[PDB]
Nucleic acid binder design. Structure first.
Ligand SMILES: [Zn+2]
Lengths: 54, 87, 118, 216, 205, 97
RNA sequence: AAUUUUCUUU
RNA sequence: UGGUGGUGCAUGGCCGUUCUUAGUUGGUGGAGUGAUUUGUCUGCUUAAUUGCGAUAACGAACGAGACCUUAACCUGCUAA
RNA sequence: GCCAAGGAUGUUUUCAUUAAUCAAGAACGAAAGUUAGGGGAUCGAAGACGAUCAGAUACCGUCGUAGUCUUAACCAUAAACUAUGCCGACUAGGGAUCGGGCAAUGUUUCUCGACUUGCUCGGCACCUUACGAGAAAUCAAAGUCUUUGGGUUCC
RNA sequence: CUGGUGCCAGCAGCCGCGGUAAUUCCAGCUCCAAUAGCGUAUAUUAAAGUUGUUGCAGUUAAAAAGCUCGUAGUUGAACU
């Protein structure tokens, strides 16, 4: 609903009217609220510590 | 081959397998080259001096590559007591 | 059925291999840590991932597991690989015995080991 | 701007190999057509047909276009490309890529005394693919190419100015016809002619020669 | 050729006998009959130890002459030779491929595992026929640690060994690493090796 | 095309073989073409051993069996599911499962 | 057990 | 110009079926002259080609799942 | 039990080209079918009834003639198949099986047999593979064929 | 391409086009091939490696006699 921005129109010609449907996937940040799809989950990279520290 | 002028005109001269004396085609993807370097006293093989052998794909599929390489090295003198002409 | 989705499997394995020391015993604490580090769109997905993470830790504590690595037994494997006994092939003088083996050894260049076999 | 993904591709991009005949000599496999594009420029192609094969399905018939292309400009280099795709445009483009990847060296000889450039095949060669047999016979200077229109067009790209042809089998199958002709042409550098009896000195190969200029 | 520096060295052949590297299982394959001595009773073939060593040093020679040791790959899908191959790649500059070969390793430039080596060293041709098939597809010489019950297809240098015993597999891998290191890497024949042959041994989890 | 190399029966070095009768439909099937099974069944079911023992004599005598050779035709064997239709790759095996 | 039939095309 | 006049066997858009289910397809590789096939599976499990696992396949895309709406207790966190 | 004959094997035995394939011409030739004699248990064409079905004339049950057996005369064909003519040379690895022969300071049972191992000849076949072939299914021949020619019949 | 008919007239060497949008029916425009020449009907030749000595094919597309003996016929080890 938020990532399949689509348009549909009828074009008139010499023969019968044709139907054109054009659907564009807006980028992931284009949710009007957020960026990540609910299927993609990212994990941050931590920092290693010294296991002795004198 | 040479024309009447005398120079060599051709795309290239194909190399012949040392085991069967047959040329190696451009799509013979099972035909490999074996490189072995000579050794001096106390080991320490000197780089830059090596002997090369070509084995065709027909021999590789037939399974005679091992015995053919044994014959080639024994004839060259690189191996001893492995291949014998009298079976 | 409660079969876990492939996204849950992959996400759980990634957080397990990334934050193994940070994990604790209580599932609710594990839920809290996942909420802290891993940003997940859905609370239900977060809880499912945390639940799989807890079960993975239960089975890993009960026994080693193959496909996850975190600065751990994946290094203890080489630590125990450096193990070396006192040369099992050394013996003293008696290795084995076989008449044809002795005949070939005597013929070629060598003399060692006694005879017996059958 | 193409970046190589193979050791041979990196060597070709750098320029270590002075000719594709070296790669042919050591029979090194080619996985990227950019190597052929670099070595052989001004290489024209020719589309033979677009066969729309079909596959019956539960709902209807699934049809895809099969394209045959022969490529090679004028000098002992011909390549056959067969590609099946949903659209003719991509089917043609894939055929060009496969033809470029399948460029093969062709040996050209003389009908009689070796006076001038090679014009015909050195020896009688043959190729069979799917019961279609194509036999190429050396021809004297003149009479051009006596062959079928597709076979004549194929031989016009290998630089063979004069050639006799003989065909047996269901020649209406274009794919088998062109495959047999390509096999016969590629067989030209497969026959141990007596002039090749000399013991050539063994080479190195580009990989061994430039094993130190190839590292990162 | 072969100098006197390749002497008898009774210690290594005693290690071969202790590791049981001279036993074939039951069956012969013609292409592996010249490497055997007189057949032992109860249907067990005995391999020529001297011929085995000669093929081993030849395999060491062919493993040498490679400027980049990373271009030499060692494959052993059998669990007996897993850590033996790992130690071989740890000592010399080779790359260890143990476990699943993932067909498409040598062809299929798209996959992330496209390595394109220059030579293949294998343990069991019967269990690793896929790697030899890929090498024959992509113009790569193959050397094998074949037994008397091996199919010498697309195999250039075959070392007649047990190929099944863990002790034999680990011992022959250790010897191959020692020979190649002696040939070019650092080691000297007159001095022993600190690395123990028993390190390569595997099994018994 | 030949569906089977042996043509469905073991006829090598012969010109004619005798035909047997199927047990179920009594069809004439050649000896080398009939599917043979050996029913080796105890004369009583395993659930009546206790009842027979409590009602027997002779101080634990041995219970006899019956040995019947069953020779089915192709159609009867398929219907009885003793032999089943297999895949093309699996057709080339003869070792019992 | 028992199960016959589907006109010529678009 | 107008037509609720015909032609839905000229059409577009929409809707209903196949389909209250789990199916479908590229790229690079392997097999086959070829139409095509593997990938998309022995087996086990699931609502699911769901997931384990083997594996000439590897890496991917759609669908399913995921997602959204709706029904259940209370926080004196800012109120009438 | 008798008679005639046969293949393979062993052989420092005999003859010495006596050989291979065939028109025309001949021998045998399953089953079914025919003419006379004997015999006819079982099964069983034709047929008789009894069920199923709308119609069953058939498939199902019982009975049932010729036939199924044999002798003396006939014919002469079957998916008579390995849907693959006969003779000869060469060609990849292995394991079973039949007949013969060779070898074992091999095993066993009151001079032999049985069993085990290796080699070899001649058959029936089998597994893997494809140097090779085919349109493919597949083929150790259907390979040694556009690189086309060992010989000879049928079609 | 424009007009007439609408499985009808018909076109058409074969595939094949025609049931109201007919690039294949008949009228117009233009284009293509040969040229003072072009088409059609028949006979023959090449393609026909579908007559095959060169040079066919016979397990499944047509095709190995059910099998054996046997004379013409064909072919016939090496050695002077
Ligand atoms: Zn039956």
């Amino acid at each position: 609903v938020d990532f399949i921005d689509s348009a549909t129109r009828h074009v008139l010609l010499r023969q019968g009217v044709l139907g054109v449907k054009v659907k564009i996937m807006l980028p992931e940040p284009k949710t009007r609220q957020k960026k990540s799809l609910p299927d993609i989950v990212v994990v941050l990279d931590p920092k290693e510590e010294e296991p002795i520290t004198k | 081959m040479e024309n009447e002028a005398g120079q060599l005109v051709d795309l290239y001269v194909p190399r012949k397998c040392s085991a069967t004396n047959r040329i190696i085609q451009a799509k013979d993807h099972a035909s490999v080259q074996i490189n072995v370097c000579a050794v001096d006293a106390e080991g320490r093989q000197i780089p830059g001096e090596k002997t090369t052998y070509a084995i065709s794909g027909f021999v590789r599929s037939k399974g005679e590559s091992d015995d053919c390489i044994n014959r080639l090295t024994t004839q060259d003198g690189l191996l001893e007591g492995v291949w014998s002409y009298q079976r | 059925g409660r079969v876990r989705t492939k996204t849950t499997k992959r996400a759980s394995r990634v957080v397990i291999e990334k934050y193994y020391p940070r994990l604790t015993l209580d599932f609710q604490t594990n839920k809290r840590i996942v909420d802290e580090v891993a940003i997940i769109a859905s609370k239900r997905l977060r809880n499912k991932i945390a639940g799989y993470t807890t079960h993975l830790m239960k089975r890993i504590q009960r026994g080693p597991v193959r496909g996850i690595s975190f600065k751990l037994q994946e290094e203890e494997r080489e630590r125990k690989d450096q193990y070396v006994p006192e040369v099992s092939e050394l013996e003293v003088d008696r290795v084995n015995v076989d008449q044809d083996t002795k005949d070939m050894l005597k013929s070629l260049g060598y003399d060692q080991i006694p005879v017996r076999v059958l | 701007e193409w970046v190589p993904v193979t050791k041979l591709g990196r060597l070709v991009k750098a320029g270590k190999i002075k000719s594709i005949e070296e790669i042919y000599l050591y029979s090194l496999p080619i996985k990227e057509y950019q190597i052929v594009d670099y070595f052989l420029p001004r290489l024209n192609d020719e589309v033979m047909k677009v066969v729309p094969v079909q596959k019956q399905t539960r709902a209807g018939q699934r049809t895809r276009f099969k394209a045959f292309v022969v490529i090679g400009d004028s000098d002992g280099h011909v390549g056959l490309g067969i590609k099946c795709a949903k659209e003719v445009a991509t089917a043609i483009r894939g055929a060009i890529i496969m033809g470029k990847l399948s460029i093969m060296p062709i040996r050209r000889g003389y009908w009689g005394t070796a006076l001038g450039d090679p014009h015909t095949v050195p020896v009688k060669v043959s190729g069979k693919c799917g019961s279609v047999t194509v036999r190429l016979v050396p021809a004297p200077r003149g009479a051009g190419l006596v062959a079928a229109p597709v076979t004549k067009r194929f031989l016009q790209l290998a630089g063979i100015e004069d050639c006799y042809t003989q065909s047996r089998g269901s020649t209406k199958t274009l794919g088998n016809f062109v495959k047999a002709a390509f096999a016969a042409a590629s067989l030209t550098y497969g026959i141990l002619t007596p002039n090749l009896w000399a013991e050539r000195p063994f080479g190195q190969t580009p990989i061994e020669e430039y094993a130190d200029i190839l590292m990162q | 050729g072969r100098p006197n520096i390749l002497n008898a060295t009774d210690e290594d052949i005693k290690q071969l006998l202790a590791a049981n590297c001279h036993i074939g299982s039951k069956n012969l394959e013609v292409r592996m009959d010249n490497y055997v001595w007189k057949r032992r009773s109860d249907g067990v073939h005995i391999l020529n130890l001297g011929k085995t060593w000669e093929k081993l040093v030849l395999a060491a020679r062919v493993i040498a002459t490679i400027e980049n040791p990373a271009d030499v790959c060692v494959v052993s899908t059998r669990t007996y030779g897993h850590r033996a191959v790992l130690k071989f790649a740890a000592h010399t500059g080779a790359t260890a491929i143990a476990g699943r070969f993932t067909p498409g390793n040598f062809t299929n430039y798209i996959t992330r595992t496209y390595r394109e080596p220059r030579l293949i060293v294998v343990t069991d041709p019967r269990a690793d026929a896929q790697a030899i098939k890929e090498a024959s597809f992509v113009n790569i010489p193959v050397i094998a640690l074949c037994d008397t019950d091996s199919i010498l297809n697309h195999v250039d240098i075959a070392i007649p060994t047990n190929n099944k015993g863990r002790k034999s597999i680990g011992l022959i891998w250790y010897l191959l690493a020692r020979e190649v290191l002696r040939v070019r890497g650092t080691l000297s024949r007159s001095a022993p090796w600190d690395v123990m042959p028993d390190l390569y041994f595997y099994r018994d989890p | 095309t030949q569906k089977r190399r042996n043509n469905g029966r073991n006829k090598h070095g012969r010109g004619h073989v005798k035909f047997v009768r199927c047990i179920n439909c009594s069809r004439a099937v050649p000896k080398d073409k009939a599917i043979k099974r050996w029913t080796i069944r105890n004369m009583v079911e395993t659930a009546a051993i206790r009842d027979l023992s409590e009602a027997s004599v002779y101080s634990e005598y041995t219970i006899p069996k019956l040995y019947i050779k069953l020779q089915y035709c192709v159609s009867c064997a398929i219907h009885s599911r003793v032999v089943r239709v297999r895949s093309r790759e699996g057709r080339r095996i003869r070792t019992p499962p």
